[PDB]
Amino acid sequence: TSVVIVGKISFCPKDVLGHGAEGTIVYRGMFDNRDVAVKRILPECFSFADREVQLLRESDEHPNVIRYFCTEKDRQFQYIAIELCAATLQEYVEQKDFAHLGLEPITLLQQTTSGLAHLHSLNIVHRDLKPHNILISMPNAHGKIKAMISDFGLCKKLAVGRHSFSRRSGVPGTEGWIAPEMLSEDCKENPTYTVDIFSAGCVFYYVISEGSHPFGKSLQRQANILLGACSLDCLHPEKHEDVIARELIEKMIAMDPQKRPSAKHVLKHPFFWSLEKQLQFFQDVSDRIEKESLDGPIVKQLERGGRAVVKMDWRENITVPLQTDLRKFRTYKGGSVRDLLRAMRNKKHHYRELPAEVRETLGTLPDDFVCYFTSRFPHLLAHTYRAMELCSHERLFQPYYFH
Numbered sequence: 001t002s003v004v005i006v007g008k009i010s011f012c013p014k015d016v017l018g019h020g021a022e023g024t025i026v027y028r029g030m031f032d033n034r035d036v037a038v039k040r041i042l043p044e045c046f047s048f049a050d051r052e053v054q055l056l057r058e059s060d061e062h063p064n065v066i067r068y069f070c071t072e073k074d075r076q077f078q079y080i081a082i083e084l085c086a087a088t089l090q091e092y093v094e095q096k097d098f099a100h101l102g103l104e105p106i107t108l109l110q111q112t113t114s115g116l117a118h119l120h121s122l123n124i125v126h127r128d129l130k131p132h133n134i135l136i137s138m139p140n141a142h143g144k145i146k147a148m149i150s151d152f153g154l155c156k157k158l159a160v161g162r163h164s165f166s167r168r169s170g171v172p173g174t175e176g177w178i179a180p181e182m183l184s185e186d187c188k189e190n191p192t193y194t195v196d197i198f199s200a201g202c203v204f205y206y207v208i209s210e211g212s213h214p215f216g217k218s219l220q221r222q223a224n225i226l227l228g229a230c231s232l233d234c235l236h237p238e239k240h241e242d243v244i245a246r247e248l249i250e251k252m253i254a255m256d257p258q259k260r261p262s263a264k265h266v267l268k269h270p271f272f273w274s275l276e277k278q279l280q281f282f283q284d285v286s287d288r289i290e291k292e293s294l295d296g297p298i299v300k301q302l303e304r305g306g307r308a309v310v311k312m313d314w315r316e317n318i319t320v321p322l323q324t325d326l327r328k329f330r331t332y333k334g335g336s337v338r339d340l341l342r343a344m345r346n347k348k349h350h351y352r353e354l355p356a357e358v359r360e361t362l363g364t365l366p367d368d369f370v371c372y373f374t375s376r377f378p379h380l381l382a383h384t385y386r387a388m389e390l391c392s393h394e395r396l397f398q399p400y401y402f403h
């Protein structure tokens, strides 16, 4: 038997892509002139997979959830056909040279999270998130790729007006990626969507560390998850991009499930912002506190812990041409976060009109200008992002926060 044909699906049995659960085999094949992955399953699984297909005429209408195509029936088997993909995220992370990837890994992280937000918005908790089932599409003609969430065998649709689900026997996920509240002792709250956030948090660090895991090597990482013993070694405490990454990830993998942000909060985090959007944040913040009281709650939050962030005096930690231009105005307090943000806002606003050598020390707008400040004050953004959560409901700030 060289080519099997079951209805609209066809494949060569020799084109094995791997296996799913024990008793399944996946083949490469064709459906309506499209490339598909075809999972063959036994009778014991027939309505177990019809339950998962019912969920997938409703969930896979999202670019970052795997497309379902067809189901066909043999005398002995069922055949499930989904979109053929090029790789898994594990394969991507472990094999590719990250020197040549730029921002792509972070975009795949965005896409994954976005697929996850879609699922959660339909009352579906995935329960088995890992690099092994985050699939990377076939590239398009310009070499562009995307991540897609797959593997819905452990998915649970919460009934209408339920916000959690209870534990059952058996392995609730994959060892090394399971949120602690699924296994821990004397736990008095039910698990919920945040279990996917914990798993994603681990996945996030796995992508950006180029293969490490917050909870150690594969042998004792589940045990370390229950103990709360994590480490994010690869993130420097004084590198802006690592600090922003850390701030997000340590919350996503929080031991207390209620401290973890929802998928939509994660999508809004500065981890995902371009340099121009970061700069725009700084500006929108400065316009927002432009006429606020030194003792009002907003400016108070922004200054709490401010001096360490500003390096005690920020005027002393900038270049000589800029320090000279600002001293002259005789208005900027060097111990204040507000005033550093205001100095940034003003220099952006008046950029063309600034003396040549000030323009040259700052570099170009927007990219170099913002990096001038974030490279010198690597906690400025993370800190400003936390403090301005007081204004998260305001319309000005909905590009930056969710709710």
Ligand SMILES: Cc1cc(NS(=O)(=O)c2ccccc2Cl)c2ccccc2c1Oc1ncccc1-c1ccnc(N[C@H]2CC[C@H](N)CC2)n1
Pocket: 017, 018, 019, 020, 026, 037, 038, 039, 049, 052, 053, 056, 066, 067, 068, 080, 081, 082, 083, 084, 085, 086, 087, 088, 091, 133, 135, 150, 151, 152, 153
């Ligand atoms: C993870 C997963 C889960 C499945 N089940 S499911 O619960 O997600 C499901 C999804 C959508 C509708 C129904 C179901 Cl049951 C799959 C069902 C059918 C076909 C493939 C499925 C599936 O994917 C694969 N499983 C095993 C081996 C390979 C795949 C697979 C899927 C898509 N593309 C590829 N391509 C591979 C190419 C070779 C690379 N080394 C890795 C990627 N593989």
